Amino acid sequence: MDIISVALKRHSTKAFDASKKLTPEQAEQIKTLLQYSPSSTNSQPWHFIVASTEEGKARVAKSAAGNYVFNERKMLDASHVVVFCAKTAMDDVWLKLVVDQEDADGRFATPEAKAANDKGRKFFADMHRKDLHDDAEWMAKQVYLNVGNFLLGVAALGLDAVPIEGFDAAILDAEFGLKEKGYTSLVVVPVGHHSVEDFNATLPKSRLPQNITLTEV
Amino acid sequence: DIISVALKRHSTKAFDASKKLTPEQAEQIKTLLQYSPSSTNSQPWHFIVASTEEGKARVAKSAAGNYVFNERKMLDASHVVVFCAKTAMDDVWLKLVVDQEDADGRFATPEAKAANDKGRKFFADMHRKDLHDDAEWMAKQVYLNVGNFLLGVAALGLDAVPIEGFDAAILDAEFGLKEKGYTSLVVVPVGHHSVEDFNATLPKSRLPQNITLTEV
Numbered sequence: 563m564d565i566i567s568v569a570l571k572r573h574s575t576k577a578f579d580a581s582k583k584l585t586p587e588q589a590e591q592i593k594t595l596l597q598y599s600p601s602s603t604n605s606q607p608w609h610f611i612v613a614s615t616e617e618g619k620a621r622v623a624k625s626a627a628g629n630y631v632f633n634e635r636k637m638l639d640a641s642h643v644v645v646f647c648a649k650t651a652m653d654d655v656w657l658k659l660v661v662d663q664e665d666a667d668g669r670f671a672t673p674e675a676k677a678a679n680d681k682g683r684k685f686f687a688d689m690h691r692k693d694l695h696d697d698a699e700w701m702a703k704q705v706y707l708n709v710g711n712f713l714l715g716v717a718a719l720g721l722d723a724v725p726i727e728g729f730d731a732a733i734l735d736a737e738f739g740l741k742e743k744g745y746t747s748l749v750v751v752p753v754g755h756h757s758v759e760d761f762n763a764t765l766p767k768s769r770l771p772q773n774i775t776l777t778e779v
Numbered sequence: 780d781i782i783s784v785a786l787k788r789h790s791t792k793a794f795d796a797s798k799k800l801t802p803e804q805a806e807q808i809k810t811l812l813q814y815s816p817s818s819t820n821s822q823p824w825h826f827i828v829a830s831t832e833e834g835k836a837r838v839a840k841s842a843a844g845n846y847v848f849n850e851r852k853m854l855d856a857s858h859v860v861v862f863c864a865k866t867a868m869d870d871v872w873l874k875l876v877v878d879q880e881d882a883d884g885r886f887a888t889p890e891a892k893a894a895n896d897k898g899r900k901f902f903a904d905m906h907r908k909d910l911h912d913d914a915e916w917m918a919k920q921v922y923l924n925v926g927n928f929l930l931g932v933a934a935l936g937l938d939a940v941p942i943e944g945f946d947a948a949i950l951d952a953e954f955g956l957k958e959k960g961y962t963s964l965v966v967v968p969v970g971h972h973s974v975e976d977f978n979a980t981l982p983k984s985r986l987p988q989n990i991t992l993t994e995v
């Protein structure tokens with residue numbers, strides 16, 4: 563199906579059917595989407611928690627407390643639930659892991675080619691960590707980009723999903739000990755098939771007119 | 780099919796200046812920009828689509844300094860999209876959004892519309908008043924739009940490259956964004972790669988899932 567039709571027809575699912583699970587093939591496909599998203603300098607400043615078991619989804623759902631109880635059932639009824647996490651700080655060890663992996667994958671023709679890439683990555687990494695002091699935000703933006711790629715991708719797979727910011731990140735981070743591991747949760751994305759209670763499945767989509775948001779030059 | 784698109788796309792390093800988007804594609808990329816999801820459907824963004832040589836020139840002025848390596852990508856691509864985010868979430872915009880949702884018929888009653896507005900303001904206030912991370916929150920939504928865009932244009936059979944290597948202060952001034960209430964975050968040239976695109980034939984590389992992903 564044409565990608566624009568996918569974009570115009572997908573929606574944020576409000577209720578999922580707990581008896582409908584992803585096929586083993588789709589389960590593998592969503593992980594592929596997560597891994598291959600692009601990122602600034604191929605920095606991949608992220609970690610993903612994919613909850614597919616009843617106990618796993620229950621642990622994530624704990625973060626939907628208080629003013630967020632409305633998002634709890636979404637996390638519990640979906641087939642799979644993805645927690646998008648961003649590193650809390652950019653360290654040289656990670657920078658080395660990335661360029662060594664690119665080297666292992668065969669992207670460099672010579673040693674100086676690898677040296678240049680690393681020097682380049684380091685340059686922009688330091689601009690954010692040392693000059694602007696905003697590497698935390700910088701990395702989080704990369705995670706949000708991944709989320710955007712993911713939502714369109716799952717929709718193109720014929721699966722329902724919903725992006726969720728309505729959860730307590732302090733609770734979720736603690737539930738999985740993310741802080742001490744060097745990460746923090748940003749977005750939760752339940753994936754599966756919608757249920758009869760998905761009131762948003764029949765409502766028309768709505769966006770501002772391009773005459774407001776877009777300028778052609 | 781979408782997985783193949785994801786694995787085959789790549790960041791284009793050089794574009795063929797004589798290859799332009801078809802009229803249809805040029806309209807399709809705008810639809811992609813408009814229809815991206817966003818928290819509370821806040822749509823805290825603005826897009827500049829440069830397709831003329833004069834326009835692309837204006838945007839390319841931001842690729843100076845140690846960013847000159849990105850200048851040619853901006854001049855040779857068929858179309859160049861500048862992704863901008865609001866600098867502050869104002870009540871007028873919140874009203875604009877709910878009014879549009881109303882016009883689009885998403886509300887069965889005035890109460891439902893009020894409930895929707897109340898809910899949106901709760902999270903808008905949480906960022907604007909409680910956390911003071913208003914600007915970052917909106918910027919994040921813009922990056923989500925970019926992610927949606929890159930996959931989408933690839934699915935359309937178009938080449939592109941996301942670019943952070945540019946001077947935002949310079950770009951903002953060239954288009955007088957600061958005064959209009961916006962700021963540039965990422966530039967995305969779109970078109971078709973040239974034989975000079977060395978990245979078109981290099982293997983793609985990503986960290987292993989055994990390090991980045993945990994199954995529970």
Ligand SMILES: Cc1cc2nc3c(=O)[nH]c(=O)nc-3n(C[C@H](O)[C@H](O)[C@H](O)COP(=O)(O)O)c2cc1C
Pocket residue numbers: 572573574575576633724725726727728729749767815816817818819820923
């Ligand atoms: C980052 C992000 C966070 C959001 N949070 C939630 C949430 O916590 N609960 C919910 O039901 N929908 C949530 N949404 C869904 C939006 O309200 C939705 O994307 C928007 O109204 C546009 O509708 P659509 O996704 O159906 O096109 C969020 C969207 C994004 C992109």
Ligand SMILES: Cc1cc2nc3c(=O)[nH]c(=O)nc-3n(C[C@H](O)[C@H](O)[C@H](O)COP(=O)(O)O)c2cc1C
Pocket residue numbers: 599600601602603604707788789790791792849940941942943944945965978983
């Ligand atoms: C937000 C963002 C900013 C980036 N900036 C630039 C840039 O300024 N110049 C460039 O040539 N590539 C740029 N990159 C491309 C990356 O190096 C690239 O996405 C990544 O190495 C993985 O490559 P792939 O896109 O070919 O899969 C950017 C990527 C993202 C997502």
Ligand SMILES: O=C(O)c1cccnc1
Pocket residue numbers: 601602603604686942943944945
């Ligand atoms: O990925 C890159 O090559 C890159 C990212 C940001 C700024 N300059 C270059």
Ligand SMILES: O=C(O)c1cccnc1
Pocket residue numbers: 727728729817818819820902
């Ligand atoms: O878009 C929503 O409905 C939303 C966004 C953030 C938190 N709670 C709800």
